C-alpha cells in the first residue's frame, strides 16, 4: 500500500470543474509510458479488495465538495442535524479521464486476460507506471462511459449465488442513450419545466439483453430469466440517476426491464417498430447524497437547453433470493453505489513492490 498520484490532460482555462480541479490536483499525463509484458507469469487479482478503489473514492469526493456546492447540505450527527448553507452558483460539469500513477519504487501490474472475470489467477500480466484514464462518472443502475470488454459481455460478480452482491456486468458494445430536455417548453404547476426524455435504440437493447440472458442461463441452466423494476428504496436507486452540468436527472427505466427470456426469446417488444425505448425523466433539486448519509438541495434548473450523451457500458444488476422460486430467476437493475462503479473499472490493476532479497539452498560452501 502506497498512495498513487493522479494525472490528467487538464486544460485549466475553461473554468470547468474537472479542469479547475485537475489544474492543481493532478500532473500532466505521461507522454510516453512504457509497458513490459511478463512471460510465464500468473497473478491473483482480487478486484474486491483492491485498495486503489478507496483512493479513487477519496479524490472524487474532494472534487465534488470543491465544486458542486449545494445551497443546503444536511448532515445528521449522532442525533442532531447540522446544516450548512453555501452560495449556489452553477458550474460547468463535464468529466475528464484521470490516470493513476505509481510513485517511485512501485509498479502496477495489469491483467490483460480478456476472459478473466476477476477474483483469481490472471494468466497474462504486464507492468506499467500509469493506468489508462478513467472518467469519474457518478451514476446508478446503468453505468456510463466506461471501458468495453474486448469480445464478450462479462459477469464479474464476487459470488453468483450470494444474492447480497451485484453482478456488475460490463458490455462489449456501448449503447448510446440520448437524454434531452424539451427546450423552450416552459410550463408551471399551480397550487412542466423539470422534464427530460431519454431515447434508447430498441435494437441495441434487444441484442444486449439477448446476449446477457444467454450468460445468465449458463449460470442458471435450468431457469427462465425474468427482469423487473426495483422493489423500493431511495429514488436514486429506484430510478436511473445521472447528472450533466448542474442538473441531476432521475429516469424511469421500467420500459427497459419487464422482459422474460427463456428460449432466448421474449417478444417483450412487440416488434413495436417504434425503434426507440423512451424513458420519462425528471430533474430534481433535493436529492440524497451519495457521499455517505445525508441530504442536499441545489438551485432550480437552467433556463435553456440541456443535453446528455452517454454510453451505456454496463449494468449494475442484482438478483433476487431465489429460494422460493420454481424454474425462474429474477433480475432487477436497481442498485449500485460508487464503490461498485469503480471496482468495475479498476479490476485490471494491482500495485506491488519488488523485494529483491531472496533465499534458496545450493551446493556451495563458504570457506571458513
Amino acid at each position, epitope marked *: 500500500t502506497t498512495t498513487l498520484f493522479c494525472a490528467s490532460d487538464a486544460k485549466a482555462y475553461d473554468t470547468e470543474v474537472h479542469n479547475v480541479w485537475a489544474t492543481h490536483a493532478c500532473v500532466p499525463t505521461d507522454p510516453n509510458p512504457q509497458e513490459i509484458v511478463l512471460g510465464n507469469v500468473t497473478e491473483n487479482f482480487n478486484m474486491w479488495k483492491n485498495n486503489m478503489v478507496e483512493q479513487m473514492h477519496e479524490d472524487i469526493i474532494s472534487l465534488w465538495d470543491q465544486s458542486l456546492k449545494p445551497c443546503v447540505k444536511l448532515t445528521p450527527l449522532c442525533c442532531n442535524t447540522s446544516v450548512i448553507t453555501q452560495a449556489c452558483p452553477k458550474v460547468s460539469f463535464e468529466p475528464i479521464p484521470i490516470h493513476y500513477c505509481a510513485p517511485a519504487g512501485f509498479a502496477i501490474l495489469k491483467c490483460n486476460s480478456k476472459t478473466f472475470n476477476g477474483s483469481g489467477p490472471c494468466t497474462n500480466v504486464s507492468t506499467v507506471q500509469c493506468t489508462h484514464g478513467i472518467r469519474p462518472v457518478v451514476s446508478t443502475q446503468l453505468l456510463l462511459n466506461g471501458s468495453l470488454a474486448e469480445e464478450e459481455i462479462v459477469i464479474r460478480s464476487e459470488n453468483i449465488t450470494d444474492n447480497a452482491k451485484t453482478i456488475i456486468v460490463q458490455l462489449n458494445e456501448a449503447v448510446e442513450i440520448n437524454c434531452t430536455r424539451p427546450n423552450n417548453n416552459t410550463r408551471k404547476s399551480i*397550487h412542466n419545466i423539470r422534464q427530460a426524455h431519454c431515447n434508447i435504440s430498441k435494437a441495441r437493447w434487444n441484442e444486449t439483453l439477448g446476449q446477457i440472458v444467454a450468460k445468465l442461463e449458463e449460470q442458471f441452466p435450468n431457469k427462465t430469466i425474468i427482469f423487473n423494476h426495483s422493489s423500493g428504496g431511495d429514488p436514486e436507486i429506484v430510478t436511473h440517476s445521472f447528472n450533466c452540468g448542474g442538473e441531476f436527472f432521475y429516469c424511469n427505466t421500467t420500459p427497459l426491464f419487464n422482459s422474460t427470456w427463456n428460449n432466448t426469446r421474449t417478444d417483450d417488444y412487440p416488434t413495436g417498430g417504434e425503434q426507440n425505448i423512451t424513458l420519462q425523466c*425528471r430533474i430534481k*433539486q433535493i436529492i440524497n447524497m451519495w457521499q455517505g448519509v445525508g441530504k442536499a438541495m441545489y*438551485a432550480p434548473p437552467i433556463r435553456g437547453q440541456i443535453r446528455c450523451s452517454s454510453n451505456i457500458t454496463g449494468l449494475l444488476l442484482t438478483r433476487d433470493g431465489g429460494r422460493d422460486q420454481n424454474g425462474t430467476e429474477t433480475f432487477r437493475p436497481g442498485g449500485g453505489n460508487m464503490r461498485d462503479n469503480w471496482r468495475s473499472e479498476l479490476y485490471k490493476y494491482k500495485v506491488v513492490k519488488i523485494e529483491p532479497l531472496g533465499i534458496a539452498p545450493t551446493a556451495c560452501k563458504r570457506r571458513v
Partner: antibody
C-alpha cells in the same frame, strides 16, 4: 390555496418572549414554504425570516438572528414564530405568508420568494 | 447591502389615469421582484410576480417590468379600489435576505 389562519393578540412585558403561529389548511403543509412579516406602525412589510418545511431549515433577518426562532409542526400544519427579548420597538402586526412549492415532497422544491397566501395579522404589544 | 428606494409615495393621480410607480435597488437584482397592493386592514396581496408576471387574479391594468437596479410599475385606467399602498420586495439574495420595500400611496 392554503387558508392560512392567524392566531390571537398578545401583550408582553419588555424582555419577555412571544410565540405566535399560523395554521395552514386545504393542502399539504410540506408543499408550502412560509415567511413571517412584521407590519410595525409607520413601517413597510418588514421581513422576519423564512422556513422551509421539506427540509427543516430556517433563515432570519440579521437584526433578529439572536432574537428569533422560526419553527413548524408538520403534524398540525402550523407555522411558528418565536421572538425573545421584546421591546416596544417590536410593537407590530405579525403574520405568516405561504409560497407554493410544487412537488416539494418528491424533491422538486424551488424555494420561491413570492408570498401569496397571507394570514390576517395579529397585534403584539408590550406593557 | 441591498436596499429598496421607492417613488415619493404621494402619487397624485385621477381614476382613469395611468399611475407610474418605481422600485430602485442599491444593488443589482434579477427578475426577483414582487409587487404588492396593501389596503388598510387587508393582506398585502401580491399582484406582480418576478418583476413582470401577473400573480393570478390580477387585472391587466396592473403591470410592470425592469432589470438591474431599476424597476417600474404602472397602473393603467386606474380604479378607485386601486388607491392602495404599493410595495416592491426583492428576494434575489441567497442565503435569503429580503428587501421588503417602503410603501407608496396613490392619492386624490
Amino acid at each position: 390555496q392554503v387558508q392560512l389562519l392567524e392566531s390571537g393578540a398578545e401583550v408582553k412585558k419588555p424582555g419577555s418572549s412571544v410565540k405566535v403561529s399560523c395554521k395552514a389548511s386545504g393542502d399539504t403543509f410540506i408543499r408550502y414554504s412560509f415567511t413571517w412579516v412584521r407590519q410595525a406602525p409607520g413601517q413597510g412589510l418588514e421581513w422576519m425570516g423564512r422556513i422551509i418545511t421539506i427540509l427543516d431549515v430556517a433563515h432570519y433577518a440579521p437584526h433578529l438572528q439572536g432574537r428569533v426562532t422560526i419553527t413548524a409542526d408538520k403534524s398540525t400544519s402550523t407555522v411558528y414564530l418565536e421572538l425573545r427579548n421584546l421591546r416596544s420597538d417590536d410593537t407590530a402586526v405579525y403574520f405568516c405568508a405561504g409560497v407554493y412549492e410544487g412537488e416539494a415532497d418528491e424533491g422538486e422544491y424551488d424555494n420561491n420568494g413570492f408570498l401569496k397566501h397571507w394570514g390576517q395579522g395579529t397585534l403584539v404589544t408590550v406593557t | 447591502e441591498l436596499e429598496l428606494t421607492q417613488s415619493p409615495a404621494t402619487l397624485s393621480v385621477s381614476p382613469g389615469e395611468r399611475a407610474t410607480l418605481s422600485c430602485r435597488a442599491s444593488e443589482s437584482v434579477s427578475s426577483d421582484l414582487a409587487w404588492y397592493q396593501q389596503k388598510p386592514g387587508q393582506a398585502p396581496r401580491l399582484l406582480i410576480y418576478g418583476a413582470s408576471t401577473r400573480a393570478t387574479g390580477v387585472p391587466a391594468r396592473f403591470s410592470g417590468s425592469g432589470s438591474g437596479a431599476e424597476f417600474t410599475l404602472t397602473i393603467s385606467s386606474l380604479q378607485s379600489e386601486d388607491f392602495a399602498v404599493y410595495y416592491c420586495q426583492q428576494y434575489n439574495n441567497w442565503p435569503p435576505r429580503y428587501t421588503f420595500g417602503q410603501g407608496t400611496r396613490l392619492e386624490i
